[PDB]
């Protein structure tokens, strides 16, 4: 657009490319997502009225010249870069806790407004110098669709569920939480089946006992290997028991048993939550 001065390309999203840009008139620095039905456009204009401190603000939606532009407030850095930058020493547990707590607040808010993210990953979790972290790049689905990171995909999606719930976001956030703690992706699959099987190898191959209805799912095969569940002490060793307890509830196979964001916020793990300042190199 002539209204914006693309400063730098900051990412290759899914629906499009994201640029750091400057508003020629106001001088405001923003994140501009460029894409490329009209009903989903409504679904979008709705995300605009989603105001919460832990959700990246969508400032403007501009549809023109066979292109859709989404203008977002600009955040300082993404969690993937911060995790990479913190790999030698690891993110301090208090900051990990603060970030998880805030993200749960953002999801509790989104979910209470019937909005699902669908594709949470470190790359779309944005942080600022003040210690805040915000959800960004919400996935629409049910519209534009019908390489890609599968590491944070909930099992029900991998098994072909056609209608996933708010539980898919809790699963993704649980995988992210584990990763912040161990400094290694929890389930780094390189294909849908490898992803699914890495989850099975760690949490055990689900069955009707722990996940009623799982054997009747679209992509479930009786021929799936039967792996036994591993202990969380080995899964996320540096995490204390309150953290492991919470993580296990965020990673329950059954979407209906999986803890909600609201309930998670009341977990004992957050009893001593604080809001530390991250050391950010910009």
Ligand X SMILES: Nc1nc(Nc2ccccc2)sc1C(=O)c1ccccc1
| Chain positions contacting ligand X, by CB under 6 A | 10-11, 13, 18, 31, 33, 56, 72-78, 123-124, 126, 136-137
**Quick check: is 60 catalytic?**
no
Residue 56 or 236 having the CB closest to ligand X: 56
272 is in an annotated binding site: no
Would the annotation count 14 as a binding residue? yes
- Nearest-angstrom CA–CA distance, 16 and 18: 7
Taking the complex as a whole, how short is the minimal distance between the CB of residue 109 and ligand X, in angstroms?
Answer: 17
Q: According to DSSP H, which parts of the chain are helical?
A: 40-47, 79-85, 93-112, 155-158, 167-182, 192-203, 232-235, 241-250, 261-265
Is residue 13 a known part of a binding site?
yes
Q: In whole angstroms, how close is the CB of 58 to ligand X at the nearest point?
A: 8
C-beta closer to ligand X: residue 133 or 239: 133
Q: Give the position of tokens 């730098």.
A: 8
Q: How far, in Å, CA of 71 to CA of 34, rounded? A: 9
DSSP, res 176? H
CB 235 within 8 A of CB 250: no
Please say which residue, 34 or 153, places its beta carbon nearer to ligand X. 34
Between 76 and 183, name the residue whose CB sits nearer to ligand X. 76
CB neighbours (10 Å) of residue 263?
Answer: 14
Q: Among 119, 169, 190, 207, which one carries the catalytic annotation?
A: 119
Exposed / middle / buried, residue 168 (Cβ in 10 Å: 0-12, 13-18, 19+): buried
In the complex, the smallest distance separating the C-beta of residue 149 from ligand X, rounded to whole angstroms, is 12
Do the Cβ atoms of 119 and 14 come closer than 8 Å? Answer: yes
160 carries a ligand binding annotation = no
Residue sitting closest to ligand X (CB) = 31
CB of 134 to ligand X, least distance (A): 8
Give the whole-angstrom CA distance, residue 277 versus residue 29. 23
**Binding site membership for ATP: which residues?**
10-18, 33, 73-75, 78, 121-124, 137
Binding positions are 10-18, 33, 73-75, 78, 121-124, 137
- Residues belonging to the active site: 119
């Amino acid at each position: 657009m002539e209204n914006f001065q693309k400063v730098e390309k900051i990412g290759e999203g899914t629906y499009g490319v994201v640029y750091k840009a400057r508003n020629k008139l106001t001088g405001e620095v923003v994140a501009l997502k460029k894409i490329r039905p009209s009903t989903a456009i409504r679904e979008i204009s709705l995300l605009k009225e989603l105001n919460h401190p832990n959700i990246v603000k969508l400032l403007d939606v501009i549809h023109t010249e066979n292109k859709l532009y989404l203008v977002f407030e600009f955040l300082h850095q993404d969690l993937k870069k911060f995790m990479d930058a913190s790999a030698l020493t690891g993110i301090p547990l208090p900051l990990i806790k603060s970030y998880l707590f805030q993200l749960l607040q953002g999801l509790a808010f989104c979910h209470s407004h019937r909005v699902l993210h669908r594709d949470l990953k470190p790359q779309n979790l944005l942080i600022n110098t003040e210690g805040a972290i915000k959800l960004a790049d919400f996935g629409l689905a049910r519209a534009f669709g019908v390489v890609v990171t599968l590491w944070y995909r909930a099992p029900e999606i991998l098994l072909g569920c056609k209608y996933y719930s708010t539980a898919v976001d809790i699963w993704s956030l649980g995988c992210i939480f584990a990763e912040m703690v161990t400094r290694r992706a929890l389930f780094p699959g390189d294909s849908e089946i490898d992803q699914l099987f890495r989850i099975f190898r760690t949490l055990g191959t689900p069955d009707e006992v722990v996940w009623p209805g799982v054997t009747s799912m679209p992509d479930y095969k009786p021929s799936f290997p039967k792996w036994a569940r591993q202990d969380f002490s080995k899964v996320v060793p540096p995490l204390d028991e309150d953290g492991r307890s919470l993580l296990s509830q965020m990673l329950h196979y059954d979407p209906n048993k999986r803890i909600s964001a609201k309930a998670a916020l009341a977990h004992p793990f957050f009893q001593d939550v604080t809001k530390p300042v991250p050391h950010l190199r910009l």
